[PDB]
Structure formats: structure tokens, C-alpha cells
């Protein structure tokens, strides 16, 4: 496992460290979307920061299951439940939860 740059914003480029983690915070509305990104590992984007992404770019094809592990770094007193989904090919970014 290596770090995925999910928070790869244009506004981050000058403070790159901020790209290594994304936020969650007290919502006011239910069912809000927190973040989204493609699972394509050899594609430009978040995966490029991982050793996996870099290495598979030295090969033309790949096959296999991937694994993304999320670590919560809030305070011990914080609680919450998130729904993480993988939408196979066909449907663009799901509109709602």
C-alpha cells in the first residue's frame, strides 16, 4: 500500500502535502457526496501517486483486483459511518447515494 492523491486539486499544487489526504466534516445535509475518482490505476489522476500506478505504467496491460484502504485520522471522540462504492463500467458518477 502507498498513498493515493484523491485530493489532487489545481489549488493544491503549491501546497502539495495537502494532496495526501482529503477531509470529512460535520454535515448539515444527509447523503452528501464526500469524494469521487476513477479506479483506473494506469490512468492520470490519483493513482499516479502510488507505487502501483507508477509500476504498472511500465507495462501495457494489467489484470486483477485492486484494494483501497482508508484510514481515518480524526480525533478519538469523532464517530461516523461512510458508504464507499465501486461502480463498474457503464454509469458515470452516480448522482446520489
Amino acid at each position: 500500500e502507498t498513498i493515493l492523491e484523491v485530493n489532487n486539486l489545481k489549488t493544491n499544487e503549491t501546497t502539495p502535502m495537502q494532496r495526501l489526504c482529503f477531509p470529512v466534516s460535520v454535515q448539515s445535509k444527509t447523503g452528501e457526496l464526500c469524494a469521487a475518482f476513477r479506479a483506473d490505476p494506469g490512468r492520470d489522476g490519483p493513482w499516479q501517486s502510488t507505487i502501483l500506478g507508477q509500476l504498472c505504467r511500465y507495462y501495457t496491460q494489467w489484470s486483477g483486483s485492486l484494494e483501497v484502504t482508508f484510514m481515518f485520522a480524526g480525533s478519538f471522540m469523532a464517530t461516523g459511518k461512510m458508504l464507499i462504492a465501486y461502480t463498474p463500467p457503464g454509469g458515470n458518477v452516480p448522482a446520489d447515494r
Binding site: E1, T2, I3, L4, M17, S49, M71, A73, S75, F76
Partner: protein, 245 residues
């Protein structure tokens, strides 16, 4: 039963009630150099308890805006206790290490340090900004001593490589809501069986806050980070007079 732990070596003992296991770098325990691999013919000195014990270095303070620190091995101890003395009096040195980084906060603070060991941590300069100047790091930066140094560009580890991939190296995280220490056991790694403790640093210890420290005002703001290390299986050879560098 995995969160509690005790480390006892030499005349020193460390305890922790919020651990997250222990890492054995590349799956190998340190060991003295075997006769098949050795090349130097003199019988080495293996001081044992006077040098294979825990030494605690100067403490650093973690702020909401800290960039991160690093230390080089065996530089950190070349001038501490009996270990340093042996490193100075001998041309050849070899050992492993037990690294224990400490940092506790409260159930209301948050943040995450990545604690990693990077073999042959060679540093680079920003090349005069433009990149037309072939500048180099000064001794004080490559071998910061026991005080360690500060990273100016953690994102590229001051060496043109991505912090995002540092986890490919032996490491642990100190995630305040989960644990308060990191422990890594490191075996000797080099292309030669023994080497100079002065001219060559086998690896570097990096402590970088990937998820910044935060807390509501009113909560304790002095959150230190302390490094305690112990040489393991320290061996020395090529005795002569003492040399500091």
C-alpha cells in the same frame, strides 16, 4: 495484548499502553556478522550491554504547521555514551537498531505522523531554485547529529522522490486516535559487512506529519515527539586512536 508492550534491553526498559504492533524491517532480525560474509581479519569487540541499550535524543515540538524531521544512523549516536566512544575508536562498525518514536496527545486531538526508515537516505538541494546551480547539502544537513534536521520540502523528501510512496519502506503511523508510538526493528543493510560509522549513514529515520495536528483552543498545545533508539548487535573492529570525523 497487541496494544500493550515492553521493550527491555541493557539497563533500559520502555513501556507503552497504546501500541500498534512492532515492525521488523524486511522481515529480518539484526544479527552479528557471520564468518562467511566477513572479510576483516581482526577479532571484533562486541561490548553488549554497554552499547545495546536505549538512548533518548532531544525532543521536538509538533505544531499545526510542522514540515517534518529526519535523523541519520549511526550519526545520531556517534557522540553518545559508550556507543559513540566505540564508534570513534574503531574504523569499522556494524549494528542494527530498535527505533521507538513517542508522541501522545488526548482523545480530543488529531493528526497522523508517518514514521519510516529509508536506507541510504541521500539528500538533494533545490539547485538554486532555477536548477542551473549544482549546489550540495552541507555536512550539517547530511549528518545533523542527534538533534536531527527539518525537511524543507517533505512532499519530495528533499530528494526528488514522492512522500506518497515512502510506505514501501519499513514504517508505522502514529495516528493520535489510535496509538502513541511506533516501533521498528532494523537489521544492518549495506553492500559491505562492516563500515565507517562516521563517513556512511546506513539509513535515515523520517517522521512526517501527513495529517496535520489539530485541536480546539484550550487543549494542551505542546505536543512533543520523542525519539528513543537502541543499537542491536553492535560490533566494532579496526581499533586505533579516537577520530570524530
Amino acid at each position: 495484548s497487541d496494544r500493550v508492550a515492553q521493550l527491555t534491553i541493557g539497563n533500559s526498559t520502555i513501556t507503552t499502553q497504546e501500541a500498534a504492533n512492532i515492525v521488523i524491517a524486511y522481515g529480518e532480525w539484526p544479527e552479528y556478522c557471520p564468518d562467511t560474509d566477513a572479510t576483516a581479519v581482526d577479532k571484533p569487540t562486541r561490548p553488549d550491554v554497554s552499547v545495546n541499550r536505549f538512548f533518548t535524543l532531544d525532543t521536538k515540538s509538533w505544531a499545526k504547521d510542522s514540515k517534518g524531521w529526519y535523523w541519520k544512523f549511526p550519526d545520531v549516536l556517534t557522540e553518545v555514551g559508550v556507543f559513540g566512544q566505540n564508534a570513534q575508536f574503531h574504523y569499522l562498525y556494524r549494528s542494527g537498531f530498535c527505533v521507538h518514536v513517542q508522541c501522545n496527545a488526548s482523545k480530543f486531538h488529531q493528526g497522523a505522523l508517518l514514521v519510516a526508515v529509508l536506507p541510504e537516505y541521500v539528500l538533494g538541494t533545490i539547485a538554486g531554485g532555477t536548477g542551473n546551480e549544482n549546489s550540495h547539502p552541507p555536512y550539517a544537513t547530511t549528518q545533523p547529529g542527534q538533534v536531527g534536521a527539518v525537511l524543507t520540502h517533505p512532499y519530495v523528501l528533499d530528494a526528488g522522490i514522492p512522500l506518497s510512496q515512502l510506505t514501501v519502506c519499513p514504517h508505522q503511523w502514529i495516528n493520535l486516535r489510535t496509538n502513541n508510538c511506533a516501533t521498528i526493528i532494523v537489521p544492518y543493510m549495506n553492500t559491505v559487512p562492516f563500515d565507517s560509522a562516521l563517513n556512511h549513514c546506513n539509513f535515515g529515520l523520517l517522521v512526517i506529519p501527513v495529517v496535520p495536528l489539530d485541536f480546539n483552543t484550550g487543549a494542551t498545545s505542546e505536543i512533543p515527539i520523542t525519539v528513543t533508539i537502541a543499537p542491536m548487535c553492535a560490533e566494532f573492529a579496526g581499533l586505533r586512536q579516537a577520530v570524530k570525523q
